[PDB]
Amino acid sequence: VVLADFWAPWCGPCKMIAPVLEELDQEMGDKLKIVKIDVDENQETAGKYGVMSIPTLLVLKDGEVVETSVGFKPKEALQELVNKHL
Amino acid sequence: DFTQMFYNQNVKQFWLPEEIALNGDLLTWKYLGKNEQDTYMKVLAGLTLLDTEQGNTGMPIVAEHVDGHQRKAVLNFMAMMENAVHAKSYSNIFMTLAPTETINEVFEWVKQNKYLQKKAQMIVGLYKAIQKDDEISLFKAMVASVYLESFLFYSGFYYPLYFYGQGKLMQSGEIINLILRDEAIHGVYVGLLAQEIYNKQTEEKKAELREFAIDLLNQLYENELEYTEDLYDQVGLSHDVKKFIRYNANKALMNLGFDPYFEEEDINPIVLNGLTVEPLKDDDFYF
Amino acid sequence: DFTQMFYNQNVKQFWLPEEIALNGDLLTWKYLGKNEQDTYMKVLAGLTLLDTEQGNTGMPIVAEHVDGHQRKAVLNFMAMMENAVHAKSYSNIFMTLAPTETINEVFEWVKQNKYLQKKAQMIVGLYKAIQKDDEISLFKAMVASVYLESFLFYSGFYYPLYFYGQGKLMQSGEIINLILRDEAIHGVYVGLLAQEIYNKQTEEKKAELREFAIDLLNQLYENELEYTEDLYDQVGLSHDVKKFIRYNANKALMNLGFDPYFEEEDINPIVLNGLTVEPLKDDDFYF
Amino acid sequence: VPKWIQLNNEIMIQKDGKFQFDKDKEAVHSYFVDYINQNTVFFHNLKEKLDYLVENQYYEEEFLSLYSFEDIKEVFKTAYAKKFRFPSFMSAFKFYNDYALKTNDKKKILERYEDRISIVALFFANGDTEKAKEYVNLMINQEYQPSTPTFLNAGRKRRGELVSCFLLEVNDSLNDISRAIDISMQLSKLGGGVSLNLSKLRAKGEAIKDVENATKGVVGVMKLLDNAFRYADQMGQRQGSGAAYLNIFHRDINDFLDTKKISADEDVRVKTLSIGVVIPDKFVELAREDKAAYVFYPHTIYKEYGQHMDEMDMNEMYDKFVDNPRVKKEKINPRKLLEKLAMLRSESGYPYIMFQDNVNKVHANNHISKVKFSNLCSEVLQASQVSSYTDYDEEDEIGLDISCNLGSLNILNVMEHKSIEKTVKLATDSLTHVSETTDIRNAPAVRRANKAMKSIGLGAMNLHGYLAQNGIAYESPEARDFANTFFMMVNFYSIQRSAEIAKEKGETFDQYEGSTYATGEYFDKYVSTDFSPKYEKIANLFEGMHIPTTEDWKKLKAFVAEHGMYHSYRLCIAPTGSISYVQSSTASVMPIMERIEERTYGNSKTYYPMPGLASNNWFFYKEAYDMDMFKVVDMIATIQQHIDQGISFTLFLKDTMTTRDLNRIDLYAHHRGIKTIYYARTK
Amino acid sequence: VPKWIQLNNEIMIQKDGKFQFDKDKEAVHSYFVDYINQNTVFFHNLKEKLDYLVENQYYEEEFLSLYSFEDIKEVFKTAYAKKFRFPSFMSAFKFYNDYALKTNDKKKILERYEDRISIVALFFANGDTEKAKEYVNLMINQEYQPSTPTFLNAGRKRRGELVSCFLLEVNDSLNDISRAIDISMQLSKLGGGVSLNLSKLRAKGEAIKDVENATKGVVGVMKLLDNAFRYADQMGQRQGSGAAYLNIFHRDINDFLDTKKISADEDVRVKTLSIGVVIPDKFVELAREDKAAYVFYPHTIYKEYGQHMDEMDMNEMYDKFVDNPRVKKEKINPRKLLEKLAMLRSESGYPYIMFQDNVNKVHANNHISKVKFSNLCSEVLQASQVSSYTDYDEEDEIGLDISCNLGSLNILNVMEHKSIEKTVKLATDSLTHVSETTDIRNAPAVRRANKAMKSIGLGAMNLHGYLAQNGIAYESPEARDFANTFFMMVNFYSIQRSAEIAKEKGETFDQYEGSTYATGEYFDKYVSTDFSPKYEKIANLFEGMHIPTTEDWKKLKAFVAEHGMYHSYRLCIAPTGSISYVQSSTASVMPIMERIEERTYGNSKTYYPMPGLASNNWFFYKEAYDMDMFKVVDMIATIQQHIDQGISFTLFLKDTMTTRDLNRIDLYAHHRGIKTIYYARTK
Ligand SMILES: [Mg+2]
Ligand SMILES: [Mg+2]
Ligand SMILES: [Mn+2]
Ligand SMILES: [Mn+2]
Ligand SMILES: [Mn+2]
Ligand SMILES: [Mn+2]
C-alpha cells in the first residue's frame, strides 16, 4: 500500500499537506509507504495518472490505483482513506 | 468594506422639496387627456403609499435589527429621506396638480385597489415577520426591501419619466428623478447587507434562500403585470412598461448578488431620455 | 400647533461636520496640558456614547410610538442627526487632534467607565421599556430623553464651550455649538410631547409622574456629580461644571412643564461667552 | 492695499447720498505717479528706445524701416502732443496690464499709451508720415480703436496674428476633418478665435464607404476640436476658444445641443468649444404652425442631389427632402427644439442663434456663397466656400474661409469730433492694411479668402455711453433714430472708402460683379429712404456734419458701379470687451450690464463706473437687465440694417423671466431682422 | 441553448473523473451540421459563386483576373482535396464569426475555410497557379497563418489594409503633431493599430519660440491621440487601439506614466492609448548603482546639439547632458521610477517595457536608425526616421514610418510536416507580396518605408502546444533547445528566401549596404556557434529535416554578401490571440494562460480546451501563471536571439508576488537580452 503525493514547490496546499504526510509516516510507516513526486519535474507520470490538479493523493495497492483524493486533507481523513486498503 | 462610502454618497445627495418650484407644471398638465391625468394620479398615489410603508416600517425595522453603529446611522439617514423628504415631495406634487377633493378620492381608490394592496401587504408581511436575533428572517425582509426599492417602484416611475423625457411635467419629473436616485442607492445598500447574511450561510441554506428570493420575485412580478395592464392599457403603454419592470427586476437581483432572471431587452428611448509595493533592495540587479 | 414649525426649523438647521475645517485647532490643541487633553477627549467620548444611543435607540423608538406622519418625520430627522451627524462629528474631531492609539484608548475607556455605563443603562432601559399603546411607559422614556438632551450632555458641553470662550479650539467649538443648537430644539420638542401625555392624566396620576421625573432627575444628577468630579478634578473645574449642570437640569424640568428644582448660581462668564420651462404658444410667433 | 486701489474703493463710499465719482481721477493720478511712472523704462531719447526695442526682439524692424527716424519722432511727438490722460483708473489698469509692452521679465513697462498708439499708427501707415500722423490723431483722440489682436501685436515681434476670427468650413471627409483640426490648432496658436461650420459633416449613424451606421456624428468632431483648442491654449494665458456651428436642420442638432447640458456626461460634454445653431426661416415657419419638422442626414442629401445640405435653400428644398425616400430623416418637434434652445441658453448661454434667412436676405455676396455660419463672437456673417482637402500627394481644392479684420469706432469720441467720415475712412484704410499684411501659411482657405474677398470688420462701441451722456435713454425712439443716422453715415463712408480704394488700386474683391453692390440692389433702400434724423434733438447731435441724403446715396451707388468696391464686407460690431476699458467706453452697442462694475484683481476689490456716469445721467445709464429686451432688439435691428455683417447681440435676462420669454425675444429678433444672437446673460 | 454549445459544455462535465475532451469534436460536428451548412449559401458551380461575389462588391475583380477560371477552379479543388476538418468547436466558431465572409445583412455565410484560404492564396500568388496551389497547401495544412488583416481582407473589396500595425515618428512641432493625429486617424480607419513615438516631443513647461513654459508636454499629445483613436475607432467593430511610446529619460516620463493611474483625473487620463516606456541600458545602470538620475527636456538637447534626445546614444550622452548647464533637466530616482513602473504594470499592465540597448545591440539596421520604440504589441522593432512635416504649400521632409506585415508559423504543423524550409520561404514570399500590394496614400512616411525597407514580420505560434503534445515542459531545457534550433532554422530560411528574392528582383532594401547583413556581422554568431539540438529527444524532432550547420550558415552569409537581402526585417512574433483559435494553436510563443479557456459569447459559456490537451499531457500544458517567469524569460531570450525584431513577451504574474518580484523579472529580462515586454497579467 502506497500513498503517492503529486505536488509542486509553488503549490500552497501542497506545502500544507507536507507536515501531515510526515506525521502519517511516523504513525503508519510500517504498513504504508509514502511517495512524493514533483509534477514540475515529472510531467510524464502526472500525465499517465491523468491527475488534474495538486495536491493529488493516489492510494496504490500492488501497482494499481484503488483510491484518489484531490486537494488538502487532514491526517485523520488520510488515515481513513489508507486504512480501507491495508 | 462599504458603509462609509455609502454614508458619503447618501449625505452628498441630500435635497429638499422646496428647491424645485412646482407651479410651472400646470402649463403642461392642462394639456393632458383625462386618461393621462388619471394614470398619472393613480401611479403617483401608488408610489406615495408604498414609500410611506418604507419610511414607517421598512427602513426603521432594518435599522433596528442590523448590528453596527455606522450601518445604523446610514439606515437612519435613509429612513429620514423617506419620511422627511420623499413623503413631503409626493404631497407637494399632488397639491399642485389636483384639488383637495380629487386627491382624497384617488387615495381612496388606490387604497382599495387589488394589485396595489397585494404588493404592499406582501412586503409589509415580511417586515412584520422579522424576529430578534434571527438573521434568516432579517434577510427575507431585506430581499423584500430591495424588491421595493429597486423593482416595485419602477412600474410607477415609468410614467413621470416618460413625461419628463418628452418635456412634459418637468418640475415634478425632476423631483421624481431625485427620489428615484435615492431609492437606487437604498436598494444597492440594503442589497449588500443581505449578501453579507447570505454569505454566512451553508450551501443548502443558500440554495433555500435563493429559492425564496426567486419565488418572491415571481409572485411580485405576476402581480406587477396585472397592475401594469390595469393602469397603462388606457394610455397604450403596457408593453413598454413590462420591459422596464423586467430590466429593473434584473437590477434588484444583481443588488442581492444573484444572476439576472430575464433576458436583456432595450428600453423605451423616451423613458431613457428621462432617466504590494516592495522596494528594490539591490542584489536584484545581479543574477 | 407646533410640529410644522419644528419640522422647518430642524431641516433648515441641517449640517455636516465636513463643512468645518478642523486643522486650525491643531496648534491650540498641541498647547494644552496632558490633563486638559485627557479631560477633553473623555468628555467628547461621553458625548459620543450618548448620541450613539439617542440615534440608534432613543429617537427611533419614540418615533415608532408617536402617532402622526409629521411628528414621525421630525423624530426621524432628529434620530438621523444624532447618529449620522452628531456622533460622527466627534470622530472628525478625534481624527484631527489625536493619534489612533489615544482614540482607541478613549473608546475602551467609555466601555469600562462606571458612571457612563450607569447613565446609559438607565436611559436605554427606559427606552426599551416602552410598551405599544401604553402612554405612561412612553412618557417615562420621553422624560429620560429630555434629561439626556437638556441635562446629561452638559457635563460634556462645558469644556468645549469653556475653551471656545477663551478663543481656543474654536473650530471644534463651532461643531459643538451646532450640536448644542440642535439638542436645545430636540429637548423642547420631546418636552412638548411628554407634556401632551402628562396633561391627559388624573391629578393623582400627575402627582406620581412628577415623583417619577424628580426621582429620576436626582438619581441621574447624583451619578453625574461623580462623573463630573472624575473628569474635571484634574483640570480644577469640577465645582464650576456642577453649577452648569444644575442650571441645565432646571431647563430640562422647564421643557417638561415643571418648576425649577435647583437654586440659581453664577456660571463662569467664559462659558457664557462660549455660547421656468414655460412652453411656447401660438401667439408668441406673431408680433 | 495700494493707494490708487484704495482711492478707487472710495467710489462706493457714499457721502451726501452721492457716489464719489471724482475720486476716480485721483485714482488714475495715484496709479500713474506711484506705479507707472516708477515702473516704465525711460530712455534718454526716442532713438535709444527704438534701438532697444528692435534689438531686443520687441519690435519688428521691417515696419520701422519704412520711415526715417525724423518721421517716427514726429509721429511720437504728435501722439504726446495731445497729452492724453486716462479718465478712469480701470482704463489705465487695463492698458498697462494687458496691452502695454513689458520687459521679458514683466517687471517694468516699455510702452505708454502714446507709444503703443504711435507704433500701431506707424504700422498702419506703411511708410507714410502724414498717414501715420492721421492715425495717431485718430487713436489718441480715441475715435477709432483697433481690435485687441491688432492693437496688441501691431509692430511687435513677439506676437500672434492681428486677425481676431477664423471661420472654417469643414467638409464631410476624414481628411477634411483632420485638416480642420490642424488649421484650428494653427490658428489658435496665432491667438484668434476659430469658428467651424459642422453642418456639412454627416450625422451619427451614417455610412462610411457603403457600410451603414458607421459615423459617430458631429459630436466626435466637436470632441476633437475641443481637445485641439485645449491643446492650443496659447500658454494658458488665454484659453483656446473655439466655436462650432450647426444648422438646426442637421440631424445631429439635438446631440449638438446636448453637449452644453450641465447634466451631460463627460463622454459627450465639450468644454472649450462654444456652440452656435443656424436657424433658417423654414424652422421658424415650422415652429409657428406647430407642425412636425424633420432633421435630415446631410450625406443622404449629398448623395441624392450632389450638393451639401447647407448649400441648398431649405425654404425651397425642405419639402423636396421630406418627400424624398432616398433622403434619411427623423421627425422632430420644432417648438420642442425651440424650447430646448431657450432652456439651454438660460442654463449656459449657448447656443448662438443665427437666423440664416435674416443674414441672407440682405447679404450682398450670395453669389459667392450664402452665409452658413458665424464666428465665435456671433457677429461675422460672410460668404464661405468649403475646401475639399484631398489625400496626401493629391492637389487639394481650396475654398474660402472667413477672417476678422476688426476695428471699433468710439461713437462718443467720433461724434464729439464731428468726424464720422474721416474716422470711418481712416479705420477702413487701417483694416485694409491689416487684411493685406496678413499672410497665414498653414491655413490655405483662410489665406485665399483674405487675398480674394478682402473683407474687414468695422464695428462701433460706446453707443450706450454716448446716449446716456447726451441725455438719451437707450430704449427711447430718439436713441434708435440716432443709431439709424449714425450707422447709415458709417455705412455710407465705409462704402465710399471701399470704392475709393478699389479705384486707387484698380481692383475690387473677387467675384464683386455678382454682388448686389455691382447690380445696385444693395443701395435700393438707401436711394429710396431718407435716414436723416426725425428728431430735432437727434438732428442737433449731427450738427456740423453732412448727413448723406438720398441724392448722396445715388452718387455713391453710381461711384460704386463705375469703380467697384474693394471690400466684400466692411462693417461688423464685435463685443468690444477688455479694450473697451482702455477707450473708456461701454462694450459694443450693447447696453451696460451694471452701472458700476465690481471687479476682483488679486486681493483687491476694484470698482469701475461706466464712463460719464454721474448724478445727472444716473438713470440714463439704465442697466441692461432692467431694459426691455424687445426695445434692445429694436435698437439692434435699427443698427443691423446699416451693417452688412452681423452684430454681437447679447441678451440680458432677469432670473424671473422663463424660457418662453427668451423664446419670445428670439422670435421677435428673427421678426425684426436680427441676424445673430450672441449670448443669454441671466442675472 | 444551441446543441453545439451544449455539447461543448460537456467538456467540463467529468465522467469517471476525466474531462470529456471527445465532446469537442462532437461539438464542432454539431456546430457545422446544424448552423454552418444550413447558413451557407451554395452555388451550382464555382463560376456562379465567383461572379456573385465579384458583382456584389465582395471580391476585387483585379486579383481574380490574372487567373483563368480553370486555374481558380483547380486551386479551390486542391483546397478541398485536403478535406480539412476543424479539430475544436472554438476554431470553427471563431473563423465563421470573425473571418468568414457573410452577406451584407450578416445572415448567411458566403465563404468556407477552404474558400477564404483559396482566395488568400490566389491573392498571394498574383497570377501563378502553381504558387497559388502551394499557398493553398501551406494554409490548409495550417503550417502558416497570415495575420488577421491579411487573412480577413485579402481579395476583398470591403477591406481596410493588410497591414496589422503602424509605427509613427512624431516630430516636435505643431505641424508634425497635427499630421501625426491625421495619420493616426487615417490608419485606424484602415483598421491597423498605430504606435507613436512621443520621445521627440518637447517636455512640459518648455519654450515655444521664445515663449517659455508654454508647452503641455507629451500628455496633451496623448489626449489628442486618444480622442483621435476614439473618433477613428472603426465605427465600433473594434475600439480604436493606439500606442504611445516615450523614452524613460524624457522629462514627462512621470506624467506619461500617470495617464494609466486609476487615481488620475480625467483631464490627464487617457483610455484608448496604450503606453510604452523605452528603457536604455543607462537607466538600468543608474538604478543598479542607486545614483540619482536626471530626466531631460528634449528641446534643450535639440537646441544644444542639433539632434533629438532619442536620436543620440543615451549611454554615451547622459554624462554630457548632465554636465551641460544649457540642457535643462530634473532629478529623479531611477529605482523609485522602476518601482513605479512595476506597480503600474501590476495595477494595469502598462507600460510596455522596451529595452532600447537590448534591441540595438543586435539590430542589423542601426545605420539607418536606432530602434526608438515598438508597436502596439511591442514586437515590431525596426529602424525609423522622423518626418519633418512643414507648413502648407511647403514640401515636407518625409521620413520612414514602420509598417509591419505580419504572418505566423504554426510550429506544431510546421514540425509535423517536416517543412520548416518550404513554409518559411512561402510565408516570406506571401509577406513580400502583402508589402508590395500595400500602398497608403494618406501616410507618406509609412508608404515610403513600405516601399524602401520592405520589412515583413514572420512570427511563430503553438510553441507551447507543440512542446506539450511532444511531452516537453515549456520551462524545461529541452524546450529551450528546441526553440533555439527551430528558430535558428526559421531565421536561416527567412534570410535565404530574402536573399533569393533580392537576387530574383535584383534589388535589396534601401540602405542595405550599411546593415550587418552586408558586412557579415549578423552571421558572426551563426558561423561561430552551432545551434543543433543538444538533447537527443529534441534532435529526434528534427528528423528528416536538414538542420543548418555552421558551414551552411557560412554559405548563406556568402550568398547574402553576393546578392543582398530584400527585407530589412523578416521575423517578429506577434501575440496572434485571435487567429490562434482558428489554427488550433496556442497564442504566440507564450505559455498557455489556462488549460481550458472559459469564454462567454452571448448567454452561453463556451469552453475551449488547449490544442491537444488530454489526460496524458495535462501537466505538460502547465498554465503560464504557475510557471517560473525566469524560465519563461530564458525561453524568450533563447527565441529572441534568432528573431531580428521583437517578441510580444507577456508577463504572467500571481497576486502573491509583489512589485519587487515584477522588477526582478524585468531586470532578469533586461539581463538575458529580452528586447520588449508586452504585458503584466495578474491572476
Ligand atoms: Mg470622402
Ligand atoms: Mg518647430
Ligand atoms: Mn422614498
Ligand atoms: Mn427608499
Ligand atoms: Mn445629538
Ligand atoms: Mn438630540
From Swiss-Prot, chain A:
GO terms for molecular function: protein-disulfide reductase activity. Coiled coil: none annotated. Keywords: Disulfide bond, Electron transport, Redox-active center, Transport. Residues 1-86 form the Thioredoxin domain. Disulfide bonds join C11-C14. One of its GO terms (cellular component) is cytoplasm. GO terms for biological process: cell redox homeostasis. The keyword Phosphoprotein does not apply. Belongs to the thioredoxin family. Participates in various redox reactions through the reversible oxidation of its active center dithiol to a disulfide and catalyzes dithiol-disulfide exchange reactions. This is Thioredoxin. It comes from Bacillus subtilis (strain 168). The chain holds residues 19 to 104 of 104 of the full protein.
UniProtKB/Swiss-Prot annotation, chains B, C:
Disruption phenotype: Essential, at least the last 3 genes of the locus cannot be deleted; could be due to polar effects on downstream ymaB. Its cofactor is Fe cation. SUPFAM superfamilies: Ferritin-like. This is Ribonucleoside-diphosphate reductase subunit beta. Belongs to the ribonucleoside diphosphate reductase small chain family. NCBIfam families: PRK09614.1-2, RNR_1b_NrdF. It comes from Bacillus subtilis (strain 168). InterPro entries: Ferritin-like_SF, RNR-like, RNR_NrdF-like, RNR_small, RNR_small_AS, RNR_small_fam. One of its GO terms (biological process) is deoxyribonucleotide biosynthetic process. Its EC number is 1.17.4.1. Binds 2 iron ions per subunit. It comes from the Bacteria. One of its GO terms (cellular component) is ribonucleoside-diphosphate reductase complex. The active site is at Y90. PROSITE patterns: RIBORED_SMALL. Tetramer of two alpha and two beta subunits.
UniProtKB/Swiss-Prot annotation, chains D, E:
GO terms for cellular component: ribonucleoside-diphosphate reductase complex. It comes from the Bacteria. Keywords: Allosteric enzyme, ATP-binding, Deoxyribonucleotide synthesis, Disulfide bond, Nucleotide-binding, Oxidoreductase. The active site is at N375, C377, E379. GO terms for molecular function: ATP binding; ribonucleoside-diphosphate reductase activity, thioredoxin disulfide as acceptor. GO terms for biological process: deoxyribonucleotide biosynthetic process. The record marks Y678, Y679 as: Important for electron transfer. Pfam families: Ribonuc_red_lgC (PF02867), Ribonuc_red_lgN (PF00317), RNR_N (PF08343). The record marks D172, R202 as: Allosteric effector binding. Induction: Part of the probable nrdI(ymaA)-nrdE-nrdF-ymaB operon. Expression is constitutive but low, dramatically induced by thymidine starvation which requires recA. Disulfide bonds join C165-C404. It is an enzyme of class 1 (oxidoreductase). The record marks C165, C404 as: Important for hydrogen atom transfer. Its EC number is 1.17.4.1. Under complex allosteric control mediated by deoxynucleoside triphosphates and ATP binding. The type of nucleotide bound at the specificity site determines substrate preference. It seems probable that ATP makes the enzyme reduce CDP and UDP, dGTP favors ADP reduction and dTTP favors GDP reduction. Disruption phenotype: Essential, at least the last 3 genes of the locus cannot be deleted; could be due to polar effects on downstream ymaB. Substrate binds at T148, S164, C165, G193, N375, L376, C377, S378, E379, P575, T576, G577, S578, I579. InterPro entries: NrdE_NrdA_C, RNR_1b_NrdE, RNR_lg_C, RNR_lsu_N, RNR_N, RNR_R1-su_N, Rrm1. Changing H250Y: In ts-A 73; temperature-sensitive lethal mutation. Tetramer of two alpha and two beta subunits. Belongs to the ribonucleoside diphosphate reductase large chain family. Provides the precursors necessary for DNA synthesis. Catalyzes the biosynthesis of deoxyribonucleotides from the corresponding ribonucleotides. This is Ribonucleoside-diphosphate reductase subunit alpha. It comes from Bacillus subtilis (strain 168).
